[PDB]
Amino acid sequence: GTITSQDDNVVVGYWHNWCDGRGYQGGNAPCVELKTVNPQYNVVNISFMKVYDIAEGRIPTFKLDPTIALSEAEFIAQIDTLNSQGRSVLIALGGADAHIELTRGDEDALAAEIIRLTDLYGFDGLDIDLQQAAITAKDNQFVIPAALKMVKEHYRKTGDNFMITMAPEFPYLTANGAYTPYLTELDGYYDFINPQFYNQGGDGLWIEGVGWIAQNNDALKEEFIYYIADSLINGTRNYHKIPHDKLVFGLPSNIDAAATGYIQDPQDLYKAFDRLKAQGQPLRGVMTWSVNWDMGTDAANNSYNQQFIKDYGNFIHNQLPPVTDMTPTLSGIVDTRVELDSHFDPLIGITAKDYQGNDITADVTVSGSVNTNQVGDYLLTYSVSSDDETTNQPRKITVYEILPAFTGITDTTVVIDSEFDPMQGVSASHPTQGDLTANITVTGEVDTNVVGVYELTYQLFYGQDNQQNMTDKRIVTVVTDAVSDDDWQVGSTYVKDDKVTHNGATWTAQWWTKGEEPGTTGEWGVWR
Ligand SMILES: [Cl-]
Ligand code: NA
Ligand code: NA
Ligand code: NA
C-alpha cells in the first residue's frame, strides 16, 4: 500500500516483534498477527528497529521474528491490509537494549536504511523510542535527526508524508533534558509525540500552590494527567513545549504491561482530557504499550480481552479533528553574563522557526539594549511573528567587573644597609586591563640604615580615567647583622657573668639564676 498518515486523533498501539513476553505481574503477552489487532488502533508501531549484532555495523535495522508465523511476504500483505483500512504502521526505532551507537557521518546510511525498510515493508513512518543509553550514546542526538530530515524530504518529493513520532519517557522532556535535540531539530517534521507516562515510579512534577504530583499516585491520577499535559502543551513548569495537536498520552495497557503508570479508573483520563479540551487545547490521542498486552493474559491465565481499547478507543476517536497550534519558536536565548567593556551582540546564537520548522531568524526583533560600559542588569525581549502568532522571550544580560589583583606585597625582613626597592617583585593584573604594574604607587619609605619596622601602603589605580582604586599594606623589617648576647630563656640556667639579651637590653647575671626574667628583678636583684 501507499504511505498512509493520520489526519485526525490517534490511538497508537505497539506491536511486539516477539512471542510470549513475560509481564510485570507474571502474565503473558502472545505474539499476534497484525490482522488481529483491533481496528481502533489506527497507528500500529512495529517494535523494534535496533542493532542486532555489532558485527553487522552501526546502522540499526529490522528483522522480523519468524516464530510469529508470518513470512516476509505475509507480513508485507498484513501491513498493506492495514493501509487499505486507512491505518498507519510505523517502525519503532529503539526499545530496550537497542544498542544504537551512531557516529557523525552515519546519517546518510541510516536514512538509506530507513528508506529501504519503508519501501520494502510499506511502513508509513518511524517512531523514535530511544531509551536509556541510546538516547545520548555517541552521536545519536545529531545523527538520528539529521537522517530523519533526509527521509522526510525524500518522501515529500513524491507527495508523501512520512510520519515521525517519538516516545520519550516523560522525565526526559524537561526544557534542557536529554530529548531536547530530537524535539528541536525535528520541530516541523514530527507529526506527534506520544510520551511514556509510565515506568517512572515516583517521578512527576511540582505544581506551585498545589504540590507534588507523581506518576505512581493513583489517588491523584486526573491531576497528574491534566497537569503534565497542560505543562507540555504550554511549555510551562519546566517542560519543553509540545503543541496540544501533537500530544498523544502514552499509557500501559494493563498492570502486566508496565511496572507503574496503569490507569486504574479511566474516568480520571476522560475528565483530564475534557478539562484540556475545555481550555481550548484538546489532545491528539492516546498511546499504549501494547496491543500484545491488550490481547494478553494475567498470571491466572485470564485474558485481558482488549480492556484498554474498550476503555479508550471510542473516547479518543469521538472527538473533533485537531486544530494546529501555529505559534513559532525561539531558540538559543539564555541569560548571559558579560565582562565590563566587552563587545556584546544580541543576535549571536539566537534563532527562530515557524510552526513548520522553516527558519525565520531574520524576522526576530529585540527590544532593550545592553550597555557593556556600565555594570548592572539589562533586560532584552526577543520577539518573532509568523502565521498570525507571536512568541516572545526575555533575556537578562548582566555586566560585571572583576577586581584587579596585586602580587608580591608580602611582609619581608631585610638586613641593615641592604638595598631595598619597594617595587621589586611587585605587580598587578586584571583579566581585561592587563598588566597594571605601572599604575601602582607606594606611600612610605624604608630606611635600611636604621633598625626598625617600616609600613608601606600600595595603591593601584585603574579603570576608565584611573578613577577606581584598591590598596594593600606591607611591613618591611630592618634587622641588624650585629651579633648579640644570646636571648634569655625561662628554662635556661645562667651563671654569674653570663650575659643575655632580653627586652632590648643586655643583662649580666650577678649570681645563679633560673626562671627569672631580666628587667623584672628590681634595682638589686639578679639581673643588672
Ligand atoms: Cl514484552
Ligand atoms: Na504504507
Ligand atoms: Na483520584
Ligand atoms: Na513503552
Ligand code: NA
Ligand atoms: Na600585607
